[PDB]
Design a protein around this ligand. Structure first.
Ligand SMILES: *P(=O)(O)OC[C@H]1O[C@@H](n2cnc3c(N)ncnc32)[C@H](O)[C@@H]1O
Ligand SMILES: [Mg+2]
Ligand SMILES: [Mg+2]
Lengths: 985, 147, 76
């Protein structure tokens, strides 16, 4: 009973069984500060059965540093009481409760227990009970720029899926007598040693088809081994292997046992000696709090730091830790004890929420067992950070001032940022900015642009949007929500509804981009990322990129004159199948889905567009004949959709659907089998329909069959929608109208000066004149997946499954068909939180204006396997131009609006280079090989005039610069790379 | 994109392409018109075939869209001019120039591959009745590829 | 010398190299074992992204070292 209209993106990551187990699990959360509230929010959005909160501590002002469900009117009220009301709105299927008192025996009601803001003695008392009663225990901590996570899921945890990857499958070419399985030509199995596989459709060795998994011994990228198959047969031909994933037994240790001999997870291999330090440091923090009535060391206090280091030495002596304590790092942990950062809270909350989901679903590999993290490279160095500047001021930013100071707070409050996109990452980024106090000063401002509107499926991970907000613009709703969170942002946020691209340069122009401080991308496509990267490179602005995919994520930072841009690297492109495979010889459900999408486009979109264009353009026929490669198709489509097969009722739509069923699932297959019979052989004697090619079979229409009726209904409904008829879903009309169909006879055709022009002219003359039919338009079908009543996904699924039955392929369902055809990107709230935390940790580095490239970090992570890694950004390449060091990315030539001849003379006289090619946009302004007359015409013109003349379009009034690409050769004739030219209009 | 396109254009200009001639249309660098000469030892001998090449914005990281314009009777070229070449769909890498694409197209013209056809009827005629395929190809190249 | 490469999806790869090998040779070996073009590979060792044109000894990569093979993602 999972609501797939809300959990559409999350089910592509977890699955139906995982969410079914999730919806029966109870989660208790102790602590309702920023980390606790982040964990609770992510858990509520995930869809657990219920969430219970326990935090009787009255609210204090500093708690607002990372708690976004607390307002300044709630001071003196318990945090849980004022947080449950706001948490109860995130998801209607997840009740949120509050307990005013906690007892040990009360813990047996919960599937998972999360502990934050609790002393070590209480944690030991709770864990001693949860461990022996088989309850998952997670303990999280966030101290300044330091974080810790501990997981204990019991001694006999069972993990059904350890990596979250789809099972591997492949097509075999031959299996020898010794189990040497070989893949097809240039096909990689992708298996590892110790994996299990099962075989089907193997010819010559039926025994392998029973289904028992067999061990895999990888011998190469194309072959592996399964053992001795002597008894099963001598040799096997063809077949398909599929990986089998087996459960794993994971054993955890209790907190009391784990303190003595911890097992670390390393978020960064560049600093492998630190987690042992943090292990002692956090225990010393707990001891110090115990010795000082629960009070942490004061910010940047030396006496407290010395006492804390004494505690650290005592603990290291007691635990018999043979480690050398780094005094600077430990005292840094002491200084930032009272820090409460929203970025660290978001990062650790995403991680801990993912761990909670692992506990409640027995999926993905949990942490084992300690995860200590630091982002100490984010500490500012351009301001004064001392006891005087870090003391609390009695404001909501005390938690952040305790780490960064008041001067850095003033720097943050004067930011002028630009956020592109308002999706999940956009909402998280806006919330983090509101909590940090970004652009709350006199000179601060926030600009957020997004052209989309709120949908039901967006609410699952965009927590700023409520069901009442469906149908409104994302940017306005996000701005209002964040203004509610931080009232100081009233009037400091401007929201646009513009798509960022070449067509919006009149709004996001020179004046707009010259006032910014940084740009943050929250997009979901690569084209927009490349465009924004080019704009930032031209205007020399810092850029923050971030991306997610299911449980994986990455963040990158682009710094002017220091690092390379986003577009300086390549990513794996999408997989496009050969046209022959799609058109005639499919062997996967993806091929059939692509074919069905093409069929939908060619039946309900292209002919309608041709008909509409015929009735609008007064010179469409001649232009189509001249330009279009196959005008016959266009003319036939116009004729058929105008006069020949125009439906006067829904009955004719049903008959048309039946005719198309025959056309696409019975007759083309007969023609194909006539051309290539099932017993045909290739040029080398091998059978034609073997291996990647599957012999098809024509389908005979059966009304009672589900798939045939689904296709008929969907096609008839879509045709009626095209012609604006009253569609029906009553089976009686279909049954009574499809019983009188007379299939026209069909027999495959064997085949066996220039009059085709006369035929085209005759066909054109048969069409009614455009003047007679004015105002008559047919509505094209624009593909839309999120609507479950437009029959688009229904039609695509029916067509794909029918073609699968043609070629004996296993059909999919609406869920997988929508995933594949819709090109849906799996999404999670936890990954979004993690990436937002990392981006906001890099944002403070950008604000501080750090110059060295080793102080920035690009981050990558996969939460399904618990992998985190960081690497320095790549420095921008340098080159030698005219014996000068020139940056290959961030350097440009600035020139006035001079003539082409003057530009060539300048490059010859100043840089000593000969200009050979000069282009702007998509045109070719100048080339060395052009005829002398054309050049002599184009030489005395200014660059603006030349561009206007060549492009045949006047420059817009708001245009203030031109970007030119120039290729030039030196004196010796060697080509030399040069930066682009910025002509000032 | 512009830099790579101009470098390829200059490379074509410097080295004599002989049996090919590719160049931009008008002043647009993202739209080329190429000419291919039918191999002498083939049914398409003495024919001129026009191709349209559309470079995407992401060039050279996405393959160019190359489509025949002159009608040709080939098992691997359909009526829309689409060419069944692996280097244009999924085997494209940012290291192949248009010259190698034209050489691949010429090689495809010099010998078809009916075992993996794009036009099943032409492949059937080629596999069954070779002489009739030869006659049809000669008639088509005299009717469309000469002029 | 033998090194290990771990992918962002959890796969493990074993490579037989020498300390004098360039990053280009390592990328070619990874392409042979995985089919990923060398220009689309992002290798990380000890917090440093390996760049083409240098050698393993520049990064102090020794036997039984672990590299990470990562990539960028397009959701958001
Ligand atoms: P995720 O898919 O959850 O949300 C992505 C958001 O980014 C916005 N977006 C995509 N592409 C653009 C451009 N070119 N300009 C502005 N905004 C963009 C979507 O509308 C989503 O809100
Ligand atoms: Mg949307
Ligand atoms: Mg999206």
């Amino acid at each position: 009973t999972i609501d797939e209209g809300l959990y559409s993106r999350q089910l592509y990551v977890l699955g139906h069984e995982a969410m079914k187990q999730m919806s029966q699990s109870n989660v208790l959360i102790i602590g309702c500060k920023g980390l606790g509230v982040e964990i609770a929010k992510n858990v509520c959005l995930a869809g657990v059965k219920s969430v219970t909160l326990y935090d009787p501590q009255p609210t204090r002002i500093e708690d607002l540093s990372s708690q976004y469900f607390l307002t300044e009117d709630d001071i003196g009220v318990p945090r849980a009481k004022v947080t449950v009301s706001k948490l109860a709105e995130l998801n209607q299927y997840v009740p949120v409760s509050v307990v005013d008192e906690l007892s040990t025996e009360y813990l047996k009601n919960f599937k998972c227990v999360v502990v934050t803001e609790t002393s070590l003695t209480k944690q030991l008392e709770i864990n001693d009970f949860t461990h022996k009663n088989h309850i998952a225990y997670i303990a999280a901590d966030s101290r300044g720029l330091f974080g810790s996570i501990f997981c204990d899921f019991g001694e006999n945890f069972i993990c059904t899926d350890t990596d979250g990857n789809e099972p591997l499958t492949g097509m075999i070419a031959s299996i020898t007598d010794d189990g040497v399985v070989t893949m097809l030509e240039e096909t990689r199995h992708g298996l590892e040693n110790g994996d299990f596989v099962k075989f089907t459709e193997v010819k010559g060795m039926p025994g392998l088809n029973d289904g028992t998994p067999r061990k895999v011994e990888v011998k190469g990228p194309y072959t592996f081994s399964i053992g001795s198959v002597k008894d099963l047969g001598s040799a096997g031909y063809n077949g398909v292997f599929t990986q089998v994933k087996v459960p794993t037994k994971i054993s955890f240790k209790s907190l009391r046992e784990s303190l003595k001999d911890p097992e670390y997870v390393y978020p960064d291999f560049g600093k492998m000696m630190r987690p042992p330090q943090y292990h002692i440091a956090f225990q010393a923090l707990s001891a110090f709090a115990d010795a000082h009535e629960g009070s942490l060391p004061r910010p940047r206090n030396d006496i407290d730091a010395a006492e804390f280091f004494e505690f650290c030495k005592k603990i290291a002596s007691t635990l018999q830790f043979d480690v050398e304590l780094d005094e600077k790092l430990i005292k840094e942990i002491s200084y930032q004890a009272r820090g409460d950062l929203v970025a660290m809270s978001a990062f650790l909350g995403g991680a801990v929420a993912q761990e909670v989901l692992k506990a409640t679903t027995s999926k993905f590999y949990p942490l084992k067992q300690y995860f200590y993290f630091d982002s100490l490279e984010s500490l500012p160095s351009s301001v004064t950070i001392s006891e005087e500047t870090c003391k609390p001021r009695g404001c909501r930013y005390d938690g952040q001032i305790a780490v960064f100071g008041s001067e850095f707070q003033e720097k943050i409050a004067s930011l002028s940022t630009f956020l592109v996109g308002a999706g999940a990452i956009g909402c998280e980024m806006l919330k983090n900015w509101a909590m940090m106090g970004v652009a709350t000063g006199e000179s601060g401002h926030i600009s957020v642009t997004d052209m989309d509107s709120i949908e039901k499926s967006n609410l699952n991970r965009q927590f700023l949007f409520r069901p009442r907000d469906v149908g409104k613009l994302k940017s306005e709703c996000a701005s209002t929500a964040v203004s509610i969170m931080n009232p100081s942002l009233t009037g400091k946020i401007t929201s646009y509804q513009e798509r960022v691209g070449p067509e919006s340069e009149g709004i996001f122009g020179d004046e707009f981009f010259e006032k910014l401080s940084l740009v943050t991308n929250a997009l979901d496509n690569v084209e927009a990322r490349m465009y924004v990267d080019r704009r930032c490179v031209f205007f020399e602005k810092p850029l923050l990129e971030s991306g997610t995919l299911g449980t994986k994520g990455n963040t990158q930072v682009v710094v002017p004159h220091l690092t390379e841009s986003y577009g300086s690297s390549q990513d794996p492109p999408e997989k496009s199948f050969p046209i022959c495979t799609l058109k005639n010889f499919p062997n996967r459900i993806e091929h059939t889905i692509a074919w069905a999408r093409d069929l939908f486009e060619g039946l309900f979109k292209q002919p309608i567009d041709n008909v509409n264009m015929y009735l609008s353009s007064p010179n469409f026929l001649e232009t189509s004949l001249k330009t279009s490669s196959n005008p016959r198709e266009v003319l036939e489509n116009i004729r058929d959709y105008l006069v020949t097969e125009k439906p006067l009722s829904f009955e004719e739509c049903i008959m048309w659907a039946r005719l198309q069923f025959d056309k696409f699932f019975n007759n083309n297959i007969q023609q194909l089998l006539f051309n290539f019979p099932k017993d045909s052989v290739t040029s080398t004697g091998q059978p034609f329909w073997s291996g990647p090619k599957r012999a098809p079979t024509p389908l005979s229409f059966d009304i009672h069959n589900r798939e045939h009726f689904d296709f008929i209904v969907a096609a008839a409904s879509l045709y009626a929608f095209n012609y604006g008829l009253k569609s029906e879903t009553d089976p009686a009309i279909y049954e009574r109208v499809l019983a009188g169909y007379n299939p026209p006879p069909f027999a495959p055709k064997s085949g066996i000066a220039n009059k085709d022009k006369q035929e085209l002219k005759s066909i054109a003359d048969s069409l009614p004149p455009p003047s007679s039919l004015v105002g008559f338009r047919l509505t094209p079908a624009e593909f839309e997946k999120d609507d479950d009543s437009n029959h688009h996904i229904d039609f695509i699924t029916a067509a794909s499954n029918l073609r699968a039955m043609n070629y004996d392929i296993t059909p999919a369902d609406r869920f997988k068909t929508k995933f594949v055809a819709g090109k849906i990107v799996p999404a999670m709230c936890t990954s979004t939180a993690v990436v937002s935390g990392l981006v906001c940790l890099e944002l403070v580095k950008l604000v501080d204006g750090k110059k060295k490239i080793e102080e920035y970090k690009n981050g990558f992570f996969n939460l399904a396997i618990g992998l985190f890694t960081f690497s320095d950004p790549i420095a921008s390449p340098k080159m030698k131009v005219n014996g000068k060091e020139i940056d290959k990315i961030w350097d440009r030539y600035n020139l006035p609006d001079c003539t082409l001849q003057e530009l060539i003379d300048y490059f010859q006289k100043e840089e000593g280079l000969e200009v050979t090619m000069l282009s702007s946009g998509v045109s070719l302004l100048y080339a060395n090989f052009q005829p002398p007359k054309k050049l002599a015409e184009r030489l005395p013109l200014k660059i603006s005039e030349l561009v206007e003349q060549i492009t045949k379009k006047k420059l817009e009034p708001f245009r203030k610069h031109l970007v030119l690409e120039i290729c030039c050769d030196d004196a010796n004739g060697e080509d030399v790379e040069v930066p682009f030219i910025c002509i000032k209009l | 994109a512009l830099k790579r396109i101009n470098r390829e254009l200059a490379d074509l200009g410097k080295d004599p392409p002989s049996s090919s001639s590719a160049g931009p249309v008008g002043d647009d660098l993202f739209h080329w018109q190429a000419t291919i000469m039918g191999p002498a030892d083939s049914p398409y001998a003495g024919g001129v075939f026009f191709l349209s090449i559309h470079f995407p914005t992401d060039y050279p990281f996405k393959p160019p869209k190359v489509n025949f314009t002159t009608r040709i009777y080939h098992p691997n070229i359909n009526s829309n001019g689409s060419i069944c070449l692996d280097i244009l769909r999924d085997q494209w890498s940012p290291a192949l120039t248009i010259s190698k694409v034209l050489l691949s197209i010429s090689s495809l013209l010099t010998d078809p591959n009916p075992d993996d056809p794009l036009v099943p009827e032409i492949a059937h005629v080629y596999k069954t009745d070779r002489s009739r395929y030869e006659l049809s190809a000669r008639e088509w190249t005299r009717k469309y590829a000469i002029g | 010398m033998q090194i290990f490469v771990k992918t962002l999806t959890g796969k493990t790869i074993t490579l037989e190299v020498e300390s004098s090998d360039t990053i280009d040779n390592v990328k070619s070996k990874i392409q042979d074992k995985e089919g990923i073009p060398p220009d689309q590979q992002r290798l990380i060792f000890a917090g440093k992204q390996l760049e083409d044109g240098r050698t393993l000894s520049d990064y102090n990569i020794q036997k039984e070292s672990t590299l990470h093979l990562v990539l960028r993602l397009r959701g958001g």
